[PDB]
Amino acid sequence: LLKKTTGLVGLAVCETPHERLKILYTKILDVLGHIPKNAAYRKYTEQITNEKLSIVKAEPDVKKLEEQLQGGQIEEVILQAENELSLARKMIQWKPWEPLVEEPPASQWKWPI
Amino acid sequence: EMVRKCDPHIGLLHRGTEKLIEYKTYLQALPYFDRLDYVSMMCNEQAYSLAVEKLLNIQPPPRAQWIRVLFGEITRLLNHIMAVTTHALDIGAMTPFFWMFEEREKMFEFYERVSGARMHAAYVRPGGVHQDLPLGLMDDIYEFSKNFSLRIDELEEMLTNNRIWRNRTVDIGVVTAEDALNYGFSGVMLRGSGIQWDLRKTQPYDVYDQVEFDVPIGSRGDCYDRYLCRVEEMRQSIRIISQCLNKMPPGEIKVDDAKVSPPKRAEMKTSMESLIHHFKLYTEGYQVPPGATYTAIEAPKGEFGVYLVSDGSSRPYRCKIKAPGFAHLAGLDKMSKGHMLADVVAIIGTQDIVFGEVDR
Amino acid sequence: TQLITVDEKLDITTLTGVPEEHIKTRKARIFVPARNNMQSGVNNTKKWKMEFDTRERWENPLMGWASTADPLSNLVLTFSTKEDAIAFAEKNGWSYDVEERKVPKPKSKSYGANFSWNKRTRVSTK
Amino acid sequence: TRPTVRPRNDVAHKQLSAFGEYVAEILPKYVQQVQVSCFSELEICIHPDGVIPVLTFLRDHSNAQFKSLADLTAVDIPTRQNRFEIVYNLLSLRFNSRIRVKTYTDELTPVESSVSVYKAANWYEREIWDMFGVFFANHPDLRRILTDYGFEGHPFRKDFPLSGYVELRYDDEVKRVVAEPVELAQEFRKFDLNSPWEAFPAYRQPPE
Amino acid sequence: GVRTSPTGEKVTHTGQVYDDEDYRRVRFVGRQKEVNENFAIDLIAEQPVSQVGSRVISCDGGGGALGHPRVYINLDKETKTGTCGYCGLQFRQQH
Amino acid sequence: EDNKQFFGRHRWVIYTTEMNGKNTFWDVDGSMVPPEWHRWLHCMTDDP
Amino acid sequence: TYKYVNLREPSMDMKSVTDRAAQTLLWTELIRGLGMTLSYLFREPATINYPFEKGPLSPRFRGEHALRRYPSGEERCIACKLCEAVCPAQAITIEAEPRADGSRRTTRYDIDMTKCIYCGFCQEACPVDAIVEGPNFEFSTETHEELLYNKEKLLNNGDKWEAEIAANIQADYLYR
Amino acid sequence: ASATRLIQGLRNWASGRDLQAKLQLRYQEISKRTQPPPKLPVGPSHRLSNNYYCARDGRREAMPPSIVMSSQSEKKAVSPAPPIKRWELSQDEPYL
Amino acid sequence: SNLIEVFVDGQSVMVEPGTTVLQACEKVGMQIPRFCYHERLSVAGNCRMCLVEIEKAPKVVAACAMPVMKGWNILTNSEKTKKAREGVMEFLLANHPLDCPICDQGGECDLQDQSMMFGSDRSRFLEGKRAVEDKNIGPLVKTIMTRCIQCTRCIRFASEIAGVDDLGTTGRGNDMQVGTYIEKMFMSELSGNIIDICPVGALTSKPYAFTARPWETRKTESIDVMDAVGSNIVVSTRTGEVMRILPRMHEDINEEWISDKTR
Amino acid sequence: TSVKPIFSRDMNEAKRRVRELYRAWYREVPNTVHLFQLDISVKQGRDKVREMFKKNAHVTDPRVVDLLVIKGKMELEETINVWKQRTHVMRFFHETEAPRPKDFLSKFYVGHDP
Ligand code: SF4
Ligand code: SF4
Ligand code: SF4
Ligand code: SF4
Ligand code: FES
Ligand SMILES: [K+]
Ligand SMILES: [Zn+2]
Secondary structure (H helix, E strand, O other): OOOOOEEEOOOOOOOOOOOOOOOHHHHHHHHHOOOOOOOHHHHHHHHHHHHHHHHHHHHHHHHHHHHHHOOHHHHHHHHHHHHHHHHHEEEEEEEOOOOOOOOOOOOOOOOOO | EEOOOOOOOOOOOOHHHHHHHHHHHHHHHHHHOOOOOOOOOOHHHHHEEEEEEEEEEEEEOOHHHHHHHHHHHHHHHHHHHHHHHOOOOHOOHHHHHHHHHHHHHHHHHHHHOOOOOOOOOOOOOOOEOOOOOOHHHHHHHHHHHHHHHHHHHHHHHHHHHOOHHHHOOOOOOOHHHHHHHHHOOOOOHOOOOOOOOHHHHHOOOOOOOOOOOOOOOOOOHHHHHHHHHHHHHHHHHHHHHHHHHHHOOOOEOOOOOOOOOOHHHEEEEEOHHHHHHHHHHOOOOOOOOOOOEEEEEEOOEEEEEEEEEEEEOOOOOEEEEEEEEHHHEEEEEEEOOOHHHHHHHHHHHHHOOOOHHHHO | OOOOOOOOOOOOOOOOOOHHHHHHHHHEEEOOOOOOOOOOOOOOOOEEEOOOOOOOOOOOOOOOOEEEHHHHHHOOOEEOOOOHHHHHHHHHOOOEEEOOOOOOOOOOOHHHHOOOOOOOOOOOOO | OOOOOOOOOOOHHHHHHHHHHHHHHHHOOOOEEEEEEEOOEEEEEEEEEHHHHHHHHHHHHHOOOOEEEEEEEEEOOOOOOOEEEEEEEEEEEEOOEEEEEEEEOOOOOEEHHHHOOOOOOHHHHHHHHHOOOOOOOOOOOOOOOOOOOOOOOOOOOOOOOOOEEEEEEEEOOEEEEEEEEEOOOOOOOOOOOOOOOOOOOOHHHOOO | OOOOOOOOOEOOOOOOOOOOHHHHHHHHHHOOOOOOOOHHHHOOOOOOEEEEEOOOEOOOOOOHHHOOOOOOEEOOOOOOOOOOOOOOOOEEEEO | OOOOOOOOOOOOOOOOEEEEEEOOOOOOOOOOOHHHHHHHHHOOOOOO | OEOOOOOOOOOOHHHHHHHHHHHHOOHHHHHHHHHHHHHOOOOOOOOOOOOOOOOOOOOOOOOOOOEEOOOOOOOOOOOOOOOHHOOOOOHHHHHEEEOOOOOEEEHHHHHHHHOOOOHHHHHOOOOOOOEEOOOOOOOOOOOHHHHEEEEHHHHHHHHHHHHHHHHHHHHHHHHO | OOOHHHHHHHHHHHOOOOOOOOOOOOOOOOOOOOOOOOOOOOOOOOOOOOOOHOOOOOOOHHOOOOOEOOOOOOOOOOOOOOOOOOOOOOOOOOOO | OEEEEEEEEEEEEOOOOEEEEHHHOOOOOOOOOOOOOOOOOOOOOOOOOOOOEEEOOEEEEEEEOOEEOOOEEEOOOHHHHHHHHHHHHHHHOOOOOOOOOOOOOOOOOOHHHHHHHHHOOOOOOOOOOOOOOOOOOOOOEOOOHHHHHOOOHHHHHHHOOOOOOHHHHHHHHHHHHEOOOEEEEOOOOOOOOHHHHHHOOOEEEOOOOOOOHHOEEEEEEEEEEOOOOOOOOEEEOOOOOEEEEEOOOOOOOOOOOOOOOOO | OEEOOOOOOOHHHHHHHHHHHHHHHHHHHHHHHHHHHOOOOOHHHHHHHHHHHHHHOOOOOOHHHHHHHHHHHHHHHHOOOOOOOHHHHHHHOOOOOOOOOOOOHHHHOOOOOO
């Protein structure tokens, strides 16, 4: 319908939101495949990204996709997809599915002292 | 003419407030909060009161909650008069300063009628409010509110459509939405940039879910939309004050737990338990169960938060005070890039900066 | 590697901003404070406390107020164990003395002992 | 317990406990504890090597989106060997929620600066340098922010006295504002206010 | 009942007066030592002893909730009156 | 009094020209008001 | 539950375009501003004639401190030190002893009026209404130590202002 | 209020607003400075029976925080709450 | 060993036979409220503040006096325990005088503190209170017997430790008065220690009277030098002036007493 | 005893940073005496710099001297940029303070301090 403005300053209108979300979701899944399968981050992120990709594939209309993606404007859904992609590319390098690097001391989180 | 870098040096009013709080009890550390945002006194009282009442696992009575919302919106009128009139006085519009400080003077008379001080009331306390509204106060609040929209109208007649006020504020200090969220902005600084966020709607406190009001949202992120947001928040504060005057319930004003709030002075001079409780609350103070809260309210400058840590004693172990002006004056350097030197006074004006809460 | 090895004694006296007079002339006292014998509650005997030696308090010539020049005259620190307080004193270069925790030894209480047949532990009245 | 007692929010307690399990199992490399207060505030106590990987997670993850850093805090607790307790308060505007990320350091171990995640932290942790003395590595402009320019010591440390060690006055001999060791005409009177009777039996610690 | 030292200085209701050789009288040189000439110890002595026919009397200082906490005084001693601890009004059993 | 003046103007004091030995013809002082008139003039009550 | 400030797309018909251009060339909003300033020129100003006219206060007003007396001349302070335990500024210094008739009375009752934050916790903590924070606010001094009140100055403020203080407490005490 | 009708009409013309209906100076419409004495109500715990403090003890119902994880299947990914509902535009005055 | 297993709120503790309920709860770090129990006096059992629920038992027991039986689960925080504490604190504050500001025990009173902790926050007492005639038992112990809660630590101290046998209860009922019954001057060498163990301001220190107040006093832990016993003391001061001398507990010297010369 | 460093791996890199900070202070002292128009000589200020560096000379921990170098760079940054005034620079010279008693006998005469 060519929404005139997103309402948020600095967040421009996306002309083709559906194909953009599909490309970002498949790129998230392609990056996320390099994480081991036992990691909970991969399981949870694949689950929510498959839900979002099926909702994007299931709706031609932009505003109905905004009401059932449940994330506000469609452009901030795209922005969140970009943030999730950058996050997953950092999670590959950090490897945080590893065991705890160091136990805290014996009364480290004891409150009150 | 341009500004390449702005380095604000602060601490010129650092008094070490939140170290002094550590050596005083909760009632004794309450009047430190009147002096942080010293144009928003009862709102900071309300934020500290809600922090302590969250840690105490008690709640105010309904009439105290309506008094806190009524005086929080009177406080919001005070603060946005201060904001708009000093932001206009620094640019050069010096006349609505004098026009609106008579209205601000009458609201300080409201504070003095209800507490005895004009600014630092120590009126909103953990447990409720200190004292009940004297007779004829709400009638005069109604007589103020009946006239105050015309004062806002003639303010808005002097500034809003003026081309000189627009030229000093329309292209000035544009904040994007993502950089407003990333710099920790809050209140009008978010809402001028399009971000639909208000703590009285989303994470509501005392009876703000029972008042009906609107949230002004800007569209360009500049000084002018933040000006229009503050003026419309004065409008909506008049709306909430009308709803508070019409829906004020009868009843008590302190919590009826006399191990938290002190008893009435007639029964302290009659009952043994009331005299013991009066003694122990005004000398030791109530003990607070151990824990760390971060209770944030929507002060008229933004999210005012208290990270209060209680060790189980009658004094705070730690009390970190989050001010909106701290993050706003941190973001001053990005908000002033590419602007002129006379734009910087407009940008320091449009961030409603009060250095008591900036410095503590 | 990303970890260095420091086998020196932990000392931070150059970083705390404390002047020399209030490091090397003060005697920290690490102690469990005694129960006030005005009261029977024992919640103030639960933690260790670090205080310092008292310095001179004199009379204000104008009002008679207690004038001091000791910045550490109100500094009382709370510690859960003795060894935490000893480590905090040694870390700051405070020479300290430690008093051991004096718990009350357990008593032998018998209400019937108040009414014995042949022992001196009878109560003469009740 | 209706009129004077705060009502318990069990729905938010269950939701925050579930999301705390979620964060603890996505990031087991750094998460040390997860707890939820009785007034329903979630605390994620992490290891200080994972300041950046946890905070970048909560800021960027689609089930978290903690896009706002509300507050950043240190707490001096001298009875711990890691006496400083760095407290992050985060706000998700998307899910209308708040989380608390807690970690620890002593005087000498640096914490990684979180300006790469929240630029809002640029002053806050700088204040943590000024008030507590915690150093933040890879900070843009780390210096004092609130104390005077020649100020020795970190004031919100609990071994630092209430009044300082120095005080200022104008001296007309040298025509200058000067610093001298602090003498108070009236000493701050210390009040031992704590009752010797136990106030809260739920918070009782077991004896030795 | 204010009195006067040999230095000419007025003695307060505490009993405070500086010594002659104390330098701190120089603060009143050219000025005045503000004392209050209504000594409460003399003004409560002016009040008469209330003869009551009860054994235990209650005092709140008058005014209800504008006086002091209400206390109960025993009047079984006949040598001594029953003095209120707050207001100093002393009572006597009339029998 | 003048109750047709607005609230703040409606009560005032013309100070005496001599109080406690001091000529106050030009040196009027706000603390010249005795405490019984200080309630009425500051409008703590309606009653003189 | 929200509204959009400044989201008006202006009209582009020749009527509104010529209206905005006449506003630009003939300065309509500037004459509106001159009209509002001219409107306040002919209003009666809000200026009270101080010192002859006084700003309105309430009986709760928290000004200068005063130690009170019972209606017999006996002072109300029974030396209990609640006002200095509650004092957020530690402005109150109290020392006591039994006087010559055995009454629990103070010998030192100091208030530093330059530490005091004038918040009135002392008068609301006082069990016997001894310390009050009266209605005097015009007590500026020329020297710092004249704002360091002892018991004599505070009892003189009580004797000076009792005729007003008792009436203010009489007007307010059913809210306390 | 004491303005003559020529200056009053000039002032209302210059402001563009009927100023006399809403005067910013206060007159006899305001409350009396002397009020009757109140009778303030008591709270809900001012009862002589069924008023044991252990049934209304708020501070002693505060518990220590529930430790959810401590270092001594196909479950759904969760969020800290349901997502925020989109705000409705004002029916009163949307500026639209 | 012959230690028996009891439970305090579920938590097990192994106790010697003859251990009371109060000592068994002490061994896990809970202090049962008390007014007449003193660990160096004999067990009186007559203030009833230590009433506590043993589960599977429909009656509160006097924890200072009741020995534990094997397998008891002591419910120190249950509903009827707290109802018993509030009822007993209500009866203690029935006839107790509103003297807390003019009292030397304010801020260091057991009755204030465990009224804040274990009692109700208001009065149902709508009657007039009793007033008890004061006594003159010497120049050291100021006597205000209206404040007396009749706990008989007077009598147990003067009998068992002081060895005097001259304080006792006359009268009967609500008219029961602790005193000497005659104009008698209680001047033992340990006569000031009844100022310590009196939980209320009925027995106060006549030299210390009205001069100070406990929260503003700094506590300096020091040694007696008035004899060669070496009694541990607290010199409590206020603004650079010595206010009074209290005892410290030392189990091997002075158990928690000091002499009148020291005091 | 395996701790995370600040900048230096051992004491040699630490002494290198101490030495470069000393070079920066030594170069800066004449500029500081000029633009704050201090009434001390350049040699007097350089002796004060040598005194402030010899005061911390007893430290063998690399993290502690790294923090001393960091705080010295902060003081230097407050000096070069005119953020200190003349008063903050002259607070290193305790000039209004009377000289303290050093031996036993004068400390006995003045008071109770050890
Ligand atoms: S003024 Fe009141 S609170 Fe203060 S010591 Fe005197 S009686 Fe107590
Ligand atoms: S008004 Fe407040 S600060 Fe002033 S003396 Fe009273 S309690 Fe202290
Ligand atoms: S003995 Fe205790 S409860 Fe009784 S008056 Fe004294 S302080 Fe109050
Ligand atoms: S005077 Fe004190 S110790 Fe003696 S019986 Fe009474 S309350 Fe107990
Ligand atoms: S303590 Fe057991 S009854 Fe007094
Ligand atoms: K006693
Ligand atoms: Zn009386």
